[PDB]
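Dear all,

This email documents one entry for the complex benchmark we are building for the journal club exercise. For each entry we list the sequence lines for every component of the assembly. Then comes the predicted three-dimensional structure of the complex as a token string, followed by one or two observations. Please use this as the template for your own entries, and keep the labels exactly as they appear.
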Amino acid sequence: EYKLVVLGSGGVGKSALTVQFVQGIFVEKYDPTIEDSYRKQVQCMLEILDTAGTEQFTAMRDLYMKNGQGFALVYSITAQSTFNDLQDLREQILRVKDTDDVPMILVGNKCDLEDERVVGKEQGQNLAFLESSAKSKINVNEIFYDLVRQ
Amino acid sequence: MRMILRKPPGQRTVDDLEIIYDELLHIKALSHLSTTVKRELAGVLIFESHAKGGTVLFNQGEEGTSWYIILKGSVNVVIYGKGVVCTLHEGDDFGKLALVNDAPRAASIVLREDNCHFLRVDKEDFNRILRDVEANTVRLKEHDQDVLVLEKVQKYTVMSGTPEKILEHFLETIRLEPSLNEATDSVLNDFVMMHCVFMPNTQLCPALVAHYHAQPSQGTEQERMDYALNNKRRVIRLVLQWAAMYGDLLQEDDVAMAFLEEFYVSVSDDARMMAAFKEQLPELEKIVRQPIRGSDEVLFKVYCIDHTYTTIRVPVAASVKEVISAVADKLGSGEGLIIVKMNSGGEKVVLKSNDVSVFTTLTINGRLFACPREQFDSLTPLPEQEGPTTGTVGTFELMSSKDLAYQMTTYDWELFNCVHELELIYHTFGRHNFKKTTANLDLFLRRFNEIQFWVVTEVCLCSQLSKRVQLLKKFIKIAAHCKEYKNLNSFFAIVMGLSNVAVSRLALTWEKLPSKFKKFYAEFESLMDPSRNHRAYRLTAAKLEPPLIPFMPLLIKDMTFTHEGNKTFIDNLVNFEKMRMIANTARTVRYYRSQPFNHQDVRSYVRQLNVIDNQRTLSQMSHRLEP
Ligand SMILES: Nc1ncnc2c1ncn2[C@@H]1O[C@@H]2COP(=O)(O)O[C@H]2[C@H]1O
Ligand SMILES: Nc1ncnc2c1ncn2[C@@H]1O[C@@H]2COP(=O)(O)O[C@H]2[C@H]1O
């Protein structure tokens, strides 16, 4: 039994990644109202707690942060804003559960499109680092593999 | 051989049946069927032959009484108002859909050429042998393109299709019989609600008019008169459902109102002349806190860097570009302005010209700013945004926990009933795509944060430890009474307020709280367990009866993931499987409001909360209450 949490600003790819991992877009219809919606066996069971759609409700992310064990700080590489929003989330994790060390991973989503790129690999590396893509299914599984190891 | 198949089913010999079965093995339309099924078909399959081209097998609108396979020749699939829609050839089958859905024939089948041979299976035979084993997808085609795709999910339901064919399908399948009023409305409800995503009024209204005036291209005078009359009865039925769904929201749509006003004239004129629509004309005549409309106007303040402001008067549904324009009018300038939202904590977001109805999407203490891009990083919050500095315990402590929770739920219900079903659709698929307001949803969703932060504010402004324990005790009571009134939203808002880092830190307060209320809260916190897709909450809400306010952030989550997890278009066709899922979620909200809900000093307090939503401030206040 494991609980991983996906964090980041809106329009980043949190939900796309979440669905792409647990089931996959298009290949099957996605029903987010059933018990197994966010659970995927991998050799152990994982529940993905995603703050997509509920970013405006600060209490929702905190509840997920409490119950979380792994954390994914996702950002778009077409948006300068999203990289700068990560520092705060990093801190807020170390407050709800109240510790010094917490298993997490930085994630750079939307790498497939680079004719709209404004952020570089440079900056993310300076801050675990992956340049993933939810739609192109690049590194989607890898993101959640690193967290169970940690 | 022909004679053998021309014999009545009950007149077939054992040797006849053996010969027929062997032939059925060469027919490729039957190859997906079992041995068992195929020999049952041997004593049922009827050989039909027609010599003349242009011979009619069946007409549109007729009852589905047969399924056909083409042995020799070809047929035209003919639909009123579009002629030959496609042709079927040797090896193809038709007539399945009407039979299985017990629906009228959606098209006519006419012999394309001279001398055609068919294998026919009549209805009662099809239903006992093939009904749940010939489960081929029904793929209706026009101009060698898929146009409607139907599957067993037991009848065939629309999985995907073009907006036009989806409409044609839901029109034809309307049953007018009074005993089916509920069933008909339920079937249409998905299209009626979800059309704004795939077939907006600018297309739907012209289409409805075209269908209303559609005439059959086949039949005797009476046969034609009756078909057209019933076609008209069906279109009126859909318009009524369409009009009911929108309600007051039609006022926001000039195209839709123009259509409806003219449609009423059409129908009233036709009623007089054809001596019809006696039940439906009066229903249509009827149609020809309070919810905020997109056309309503607001006096909104937009702030400059030096904290002076402009008051603008614009519609609620105004775009950011329209807001920028209104600011540029009063400041009298054309010097590249951007609109930026700002939190009490100084966090800034640049809004895009594309965005509409932004006023209600601000945080509780958020403000709107207009500045050139160079000023973005220098912007600093207004003192107004930082919330109260002294508590209000002295006021609401003197108020009953039961009275507070009741006035909360009363106010919550007024706010919840202001939210239109369609606002959930608009919010999920993005406001800019519809240019419609979700102001009612925006404000109701904001209320969850308001209640949450109200709790945290009052606790953090309460310096006396004795009274602070009395506060925690009182909130838990207010929460408990909210859960009783079935206001789960406000219940979770209080619980989550107590869960807040600034409140959960205060050990000396929590420890001094009676273990009676320690256990109450621990149970409340367990109802929040995100485990197994919030199973704890979902089971709780399922048990409850109609008049209830659900946990709103979870509803918004479901909607978000239904949208991102599923494509809107599959093969350039509307993914109607997705459309149903969204519609189901909205209907759940409809079910929660299907029943109504059963001290002016308490009312005024509950409806005028002044709250700190700055987490940094609340954490610092918490730290000097208990270091
Ligand atoms: N059984 C039939 N159903 C519909 N149209 C038919 C039939 N038999 C002949 N037709 C003619 O074929 C025409 C094809 O184009 P229309 O639908 O405009 O009008 C149609 C009729 O005039
Ligand atoms: N575009 C189409 N619309 C309606 N029917 C079609 C279409 N293409 C093929 N058909 C076939 O024509 C049949 C007419 O009767 P049914 O609706 O029972 O089943 C229909 C299909 O088998």
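Observations: The first strand of chain B starts at residue 46 and ends at 50. Residues 221-246 of chain B form the longest helix (26 residues).
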